[PDB]
A paper describes a structure:
The high symmetry of the Tako protein is evident from the crystal structure, and determination of the space group proved challenging ([name] crystal No. 2). In both crystal forms the [name] molecules show a conserved interaction at the top side where two proteins meet face to face. The crystal-packing interaction is mediated by a hydrogen-bonding pattern with eightfold symmetry. The difference between the two crystal forms arises from different water-mediated interactions at the outer rim of the toroid. The individual repeats of the [name] protein can be perfectly aligned. In comparison, only the alternating repeats of the Ika proteins can be superposed, in contrast to the template structure where the overlap of the individual blades is much poorer. The symmetry is also visible in the electrostatic potential map, where eightfold and fourfold symmetry can be observed for [name] and Ika8, respectively, with the exception of small differences owing to crystal-packing inter­actions; such charge symmetry is absent from the template protein. [name] was found to have highest stability around pH 8, but to be extremely unstable in the absence of salt. Increasing the salt concentration led to increased stability over the tested pH range.
WD40 proteins are a subfamily of propeller proteins with no intrinsic enzymatic activity, but their stable, modular architecture and versatile surface have allowed evolution to adapt them to many vital roles. By computationally reverse-engineering the duplication, fusion and diversification events in the evolutionary history of a WD40 protein, a perfectly symmetrical homologue called [name] was made. A different computational approach was employed to redesign [name] to create Ika8, a fourfold-symmetrical protein in which neighbouring blades carry compensating charges. Tako and Ika are the first successfully designed eight-bladed WD40-repeat proteins for which structures have been confirmed crystallographically.
Numbering used by the authors: 2 to 320
Write the structure that this text describes.
Amino acid sequence: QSLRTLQGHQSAVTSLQFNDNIVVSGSDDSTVKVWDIKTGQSLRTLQGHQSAVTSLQFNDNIVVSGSDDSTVKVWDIKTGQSLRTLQGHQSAVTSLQFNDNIVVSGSDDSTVKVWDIKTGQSLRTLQGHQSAVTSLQFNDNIVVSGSDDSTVKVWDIKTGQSLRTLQGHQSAVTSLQFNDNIVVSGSDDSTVKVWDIKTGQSLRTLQGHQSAVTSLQFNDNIVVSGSDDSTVKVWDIKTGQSLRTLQGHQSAVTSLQFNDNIVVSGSDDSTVKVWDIKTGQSLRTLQGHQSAVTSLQFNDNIVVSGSDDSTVKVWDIKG
């Protein structure tokens, strides 16, 4: 069931992230909007971007967004003003992640750039990729980046060098997740690969998808991936076997998220689907979107989804 349909975005919503009392949405209208999830009304419209917003991340005080204008901006989430503009990328910024000290941005110019968040200076520039960087993730020591060059590269977050290059994918890498033990990468070649992060060798290749893999997520036991073949698949990470295939969507799966109990997926068929992961059976179909679903996020009881119809919708996860 839909509770609140947030409105005021004039173009497709690309990214979102919500807490207990606010939602932060990025869209193709070059604006970032802050809303009150309870009332469903807009508080602040963050302006300064000259093209579509591709990703975002916020904490209690700060919002960090990436846009198609090759800039990463840092916003005060309460006053609505822009604090820093980070300039160094020469093409669209596709992914971002930031902590207390630094921000890390991936771009179409095949470079990952590290910036000390309170300075705005370009600390490091990670060179090595031959095409657009699509996804990234870093911890205290290292950075793992995916790119259109069909390779996943590991870097040292402070030395600025490349540690390993994970090779085997025959098409662009779209998503990645990693721990100190392994990395998990999805690619356009319809395969998900599990690698040993320490040595950079391929531990397994998950096969079964008939088209590009768009999103993934894994815990200690399982990998959950969504593909362009309108299906979500469950895998066993150590075995490499296919566990369950979730079938209900009639178009490509774009975003997903899961826990020990359920799997919440978004697709281009304008529907968000909640499934019991143990069964592999659909529990609900969230309807109300008039166009493709681009991003989602859920907690214990509600789901927040963004769609191409320039709307952000809140859903009761099981009501």
